Structure formats: structure tokens, C-alpha cells
A = this chain, B = another copy of it.
Amino acid sequence: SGFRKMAFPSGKVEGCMVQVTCGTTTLNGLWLDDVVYCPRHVICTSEDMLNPNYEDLLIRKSNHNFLVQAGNVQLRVIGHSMQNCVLKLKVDTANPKTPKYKFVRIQPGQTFSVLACYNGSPSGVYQCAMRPNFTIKGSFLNGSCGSVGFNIDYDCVSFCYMHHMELPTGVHAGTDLEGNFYGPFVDRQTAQAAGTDTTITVNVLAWLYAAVINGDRWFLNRFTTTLNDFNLVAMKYNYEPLTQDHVDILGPLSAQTGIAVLDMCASLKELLQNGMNGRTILGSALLEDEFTPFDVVRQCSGVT
């Protein structure tokens, strides 16, 4: 027993991280097969970032201007193309450590692990969630751009995020591995404010089920609710609306614990209305929303 914020083992992704330098800008790249993926702003100087014309800046670049280093060895760049906000640098050597992989575009509320890197070297791994406003609350310092987010299904890595930006409010923005930003963000140092960071309701319910499974049951009340009544309270607390699809996805946790989804919703409603009263749930004084229903099942069952 015990429930922890857990990241996927990062080894498979550590074997893909490379350093990419263009001129005086250095960041991280992802080396899969004979292609290195990195944020296109590797071609910008800090001055260019204020209002960059990427196509124009790229005209002044050749294969030999992109310096790719894997460990302490240099990779030969034999091609380069821009796809949305990422550059794909074709190299002459397929990464020998390429794991089975996919590129997926996740939905808000979905969680993933990030392997924070600096100069192509992994520094740490943590678990994130794509917020409903399409930002992520990460930990990224200068040099961390190009670090990726991913999920693992047995031996296949689904890459879902690449780090590009930090908004003026300290939250983070990035793209999927096709270079499309999540949300309305752009790779330009301009006024980009995030929308409401609402709470991922279905994740909070999944985490309340994990708490019950691990012994924390004090918050279970004697009430039930309906989706409509619950959602009126959820709107008031800046919680995402709960749908019948969310109820269906919580079905296995409802079955394992014997607590109906709408009963857990009523417990959540009372926690929102009355507060925690100085108490904790799974060692937290706030309702955790960065565990999906699948993460709860995986951790509570032992998926490897």
C-alpha cells in the first residue's frame, strides 16, 4: 500500500537525449531513429525571440550550423526541416537506443512524466498533467528547452510534450512532437496570459478512490448527488465539469471500492463546501488532480 506521485522509469528516454546547438543557443534534442527533434527557437538569439520570423531565420542556416552531440560524440547532420514549432534534423546514424515509440497529442487533464535535461543530460524526472488551460506546471530552468514529456505502455514510449516556453507567470508551454503547441501559445517572448487553471475533477475523484483503497476514508460522507447538482458546485469552485464519459472511466474504481461514482462526487462536494478542516488525504491538505483514473489503477495494481 501507500500512494505516491510517480513518474514512469526514464531510462528509455534518457537514451534519446542529445544536446543541440545553433550558433550560441544550446538546448536539448530528442534522437529517435535517424532524426533529432528540437524546438525551432534553437536558431534564435535572445534578441530574435521578441519577434522571430522563423522561416527567414532558417534561410541563414545550413546542415553544418546545427551541432548535435550525443554523450561526448558529434552526430553528422545530413538534412533539416521545420515542422510547425520543431526542427527535425536528419542525422547519418540511427540512435542505437531508439525504443518503440509513438507521438501522441494528449488531452487536458492527462498526465505524463517529464525528463528535465540540461545540455542533453538528464537531471531529473517528475510527473505533470496538461492543465485545462493547456499549460503545465513544470520545473524548467534556462537550458531545459527540448526536454520531453512521455507515457510508457510496457515497452513503447508515447512522447506527448516538448518544452519550449515559460510564460511571464512562471507556468510552462510547449508542443506535441509534431511541433504544434498545446493551447494558444506561440514561441515568441510576448504577452501570453493563461486562462483559468481549473481543477481536473475526474482526476480528483480518481485520487479520492486511491485514498479509500489506501485507508484514508474520513471524508466519505452519507450523501449522494447527480451530475447536474455536482456540476453546479464544481463550476462555483473552478472545477472542470464532470461528464458521463468521466463517470464511465471511474467505473473500475467504483467497482473495486464499492463506492458509486456519484457518492464520491457528493463526498467531493462536501470537501469543497466545508474544506479539509486541517485534515489531510494521502498526505495532502489540498485535493490532488494530477493522477488520472488509469494512473490510480496502474499504481494500485502494479503495472510494469
Q: Which of A38-46, A56-64, A84-92, A122-130 lies on the face that meets chain B?
A: A122-130
Whether B140 and A2, one on each chain, are in contact in the complex, defined by CB atoms closer than 8 angstroms, is yes
Is A251 located at the chain interface by the 8 A CB criterion? no
Q: For residue A285, which residues in chain B have a CB less than 8 angstroms away from its CB? A: 276, 284-286
Check if A1 is an interface residue, CB within 8 A of chain B: yes
Measured in the bound complex, the distance between the Cα atoms of B122 and A5 in whole Å is 15
CA distance A3 to B171 in the complex (A): 11
- How many copies, total? 2
Q: Is the CB of B122 within 8 A of A304?
A: yes
Judge if A14 is at the interface, Cβ distance under 8 Å: yes
Complex contacts, A3 vs chain B, CB 8 Å = 139
* Residues on the B chain within 8 Å of A14, using CB: 9, 11
Q: Is A109 an interface residue (CB 8 A)?
A: no
Q: Check A4 against B304 for contact (C-beta < 8 Å).
A: no
How close is A113's CB to chain B, nearest CB, in angstroms? Answer: 8
13 more CB-based (< 8 A) A-B contacts, given A4-B137, A9-B122, A285-B285: A1-B166, A2-B137, A2-B170, A3-B139, A4-B124, A4-B126, A9-B123, A9-B125, A11-B11, A11-B122, A124-B299, A139-B299, A141-B301
Which residues in A have some Cβ–Cβ distance to B below 8 Å?
Answer: 1-12, 14-15, 115-119, 121-126, 137-144, 166, 170-172, 214-215, 275-276, 278, 280, 283-286, 298-304
